[PDB]
Structure 1
Amino acid sequence: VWKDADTTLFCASDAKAHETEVHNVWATHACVPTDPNPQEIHLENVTENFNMWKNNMVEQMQEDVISLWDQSLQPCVKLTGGSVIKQACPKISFDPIPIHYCTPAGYVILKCNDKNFNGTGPCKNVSSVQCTHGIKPVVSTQLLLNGSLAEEEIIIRSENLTNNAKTIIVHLNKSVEINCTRPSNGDIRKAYCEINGTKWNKVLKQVTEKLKEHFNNKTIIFQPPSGGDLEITMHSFNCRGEFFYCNTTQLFNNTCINGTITLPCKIKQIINMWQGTGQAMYAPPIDGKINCVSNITGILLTRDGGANNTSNETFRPGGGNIKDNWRSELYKYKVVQIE
């Protein structure tokens, strides 16, 4: 017998003890080796209720990533609470690695295995595991990168679709590579991201049809953010330690519903910390070809209000709350206490 409960989890990874890469260094001192032969018991005729939007696991992973960033990515100048903190800003080696989250004795993680599970409600096929799958602490906005893919159909996730204030999580079932590069040899901060239009437009079309099922077949329209900070109005992410802000206006237009989509990007040194502490400044970009090839596995959308009396539903790319990022991976997990 068991019951829903919250306990301090521990992490596990395959980090290299000799790697200077920040993630490997952190997991080396904060995590333990992964289990080569992990056990997984499938519970038959067992119904369990999940709620990705109220999962303490998310808060804990958030706490780790914050700690990891505080120890690895300390800015030269930190502006928070009216206070000004000045420190060293040494360039580091940055590349996220899979992090497993496990439960201690007396506790076990329940995993929903329903192909089209949407994060909330009862789960028919449930199994018990000691640790979650390897999850990369990839911090980004608008587009979810290097995440897990849906096994069957594209899944729309939301704590309450009827409420436009609640962020929407689109879980893709097919990856779409996005190639971002900062050429060496001008503007050392000017960069660009290349996406396969044909591949993207088709996926975006599938996402559209999917949204129709959830919005009574209302016309689905995409539009670029109306306002807000750059971290939200643009696809912000970290590549090789550099903060990239990409203009995603060519991705979210409703005309192509076929060549190579080239997004105008730019590396920023001054960023609005996702930890919600304030502003932080980092050193200028390093030299050489800064390139990161990521797989788009999800999209964060915010729906416009005041469209009740119309047949249109406008969706814009959003983000800001990195917790939603962890939810897109921890949705099928929950901790229970055993007795």
Structure 2
Amino acid sequence: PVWKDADTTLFCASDAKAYETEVHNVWATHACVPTDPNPQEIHLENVTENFNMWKNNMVEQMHEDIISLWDQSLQPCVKLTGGSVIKQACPKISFDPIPIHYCTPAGYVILKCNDKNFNGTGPCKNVSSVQCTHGIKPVVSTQLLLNGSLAEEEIIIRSENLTNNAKTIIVHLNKSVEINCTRPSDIRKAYCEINGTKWNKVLKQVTEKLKEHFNNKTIIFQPPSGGDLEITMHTFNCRGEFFYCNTTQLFNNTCIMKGCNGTITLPCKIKQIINMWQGTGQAMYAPPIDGKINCVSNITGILLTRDGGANNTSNETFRPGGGDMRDNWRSELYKYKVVQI
């Protein structure tokens, strides 16, 4: 059919409800068009196409969208940016992500890799074309990727360069793991419950898959090596509240029989004052709503950074990472790319 690699401005589509006060719905109601009522995916016969999830302008575009959404939607009591501050009103909002589709304009199409074990870079042999991506939830989080899609076959390790330890690793799970987080009815104290059995089994498999890529070496997990709390903790937004959860128990190493196939309870705190993931500085929000604040989510992936300086050692050490939300969008946009017809 003839196409070439190209960049261009996308638009978005949604099933947002015009009658909803939820912020993602409000934003998508006025910034996206309705979802394609009859989506058509066209398989491309005997077509091999190179992809590179690490060099994908769709990622930067979605990133700019979600920045826009959060800036219009979240109302901090005070926000400190660029040697300045502005104080406002900060009402509690309705907050629950909805899927967003990304669609090409005229003269362009989206190619979709359906190779089940595709790692994000290189050739894809089973390629289709679509007018829009599937609906992607823009879930902001560190350490754990939440409410995403799953790898269809095996656990996938995605990295721009595994030998470069400064390059973030995205682990794509093939089996979701529930994380159930609650502030019951100290108002800022909360906790997350994870099935230890389910989690440790998944984690043992992740270690095995990491061993395949690192010449059979010993794989050890460690807590983050300092930084801001947003990256030292699993950080996410739950119904408008910013949860900071300690994941030391998640990355034990011991449980990979010692009394650890029960429930894992991670200590959390709701924080009013955060370091924004947009990079702009510090923001302060209002105290949490009264009553039971609950969010149950699927762990669909893991963000990891590997220690340096272990070349002459027998081990490789991995720590939960994150903070660059582009990697969150990357973990869902990896199989898409825009081409010009």
Deviations along 1:138-162, whole A, 9 cap, x unmatched? Answer: 0000000000000000000000000
* Partner SS, residue 151 of structure 1: coil
CA distance in 1, matches of 2:48, 2:89: 53
Q: Deviations over 1:279-304 (max 9, x none)?
A: 00001111010000000000000000
Deviation (angstroms), 1:198: 0.3
Question: Cα offset for 1:35?
Answer: 1.6
Cα distance between partner residues in 1 of 2:154 and 2:37: 30
Q: Secondary structure at the match of 1:176?
A: strand
Instruction: Measure the CA separation in 2 of the matches of 1:11 and 1:84.
Output: 32
- The 5-angstrom pairing of residues 290-301 of structure 1 reads 290-301=293-304
Report the number of matched residues: 336
Q: Does 1:263 align with 2:262?
A: no
> Structure 1, residues 149-188: CA drift from partner, whole Å, max 9, x if none?
000000000000000100000000000000000001xx00
The residue number in structure 2 matching 1:230 is 229
TM-score relative to the length of structure 2: 0.98
CA drift at 1:305:
0.5
5+ long unaligned stretches in structure 2 = none
Q: Could you tell me how far apart the structure 2 residues matched to 1:271 and 1:207 are?
A: 31
For the pair 1:127 / 2:114, whether they are aligned, the reply is: no
Question: Percent identical across equivalent pairs?
Answer: 98
CA displacement at 1:195 relative to structure 2: 0.1
In 1, Cα distance between equivalents of 2:88 and 2:120: 42
Q: CA deviation at 1:74?
A: 2.4
Q: Which runs of 4+ in 1 moved over 6 A?
A: none
The residue number in structure 2 matching 1:202 is: 201
- Give the whole-Å Cα distance in 2 for the aligned partners of 1:33 and 1:90: 28
Q: Offset of 1:76 from its aligned partner?
A: 1.1
Supply the RMSD in Å over aligned alpha carbons: 0.6
For 2:169 and 2:46, the matched residues in 1 are separated by: 31
Partners of 1:85 and 1:315 lie apart in 2 by: 40
CA distance in 2, matches of 1:74, 1:205: 41
What is the alpha-carbon distance in structure 1 between the residues aligned to residue 265 and residue 104 of structure 2?
44
2:333 alignment counterpart: 330
SS at match of 1:261: strand
- CA distance in structure 2 between the partners assigned to 1:256 and 1:214 by the alignment: 22
Question: Deviation digits for residues 291-329 of structure 1, max 9, x if unmatched?
Answer: 000000000000001111111000000000000000000
What corresponds to 2:316 in structure 1? 313
Q: How big is each residue's C-alpha offset from its partner over 1:113-132, in whole Å with a ceiling of 9 and x where there is no partner?
A: 10000000011111000000
Corresponding position of 1:218: 217
Deviation at 1:245, TM superposition (A): 0.1
Report the CA distance between 1:36 and its aligned residue: 2.7
Q: Provide the C-alpha distance between the structure 2 equivalents of 1:39 and 1:225, rounded to a whole number of angstroms.
A: 44
| 1:257-291 deviation per Cα after TM superposition (whole angstroms, max 9, x unaligned) | 11000000000000000000000000111101000
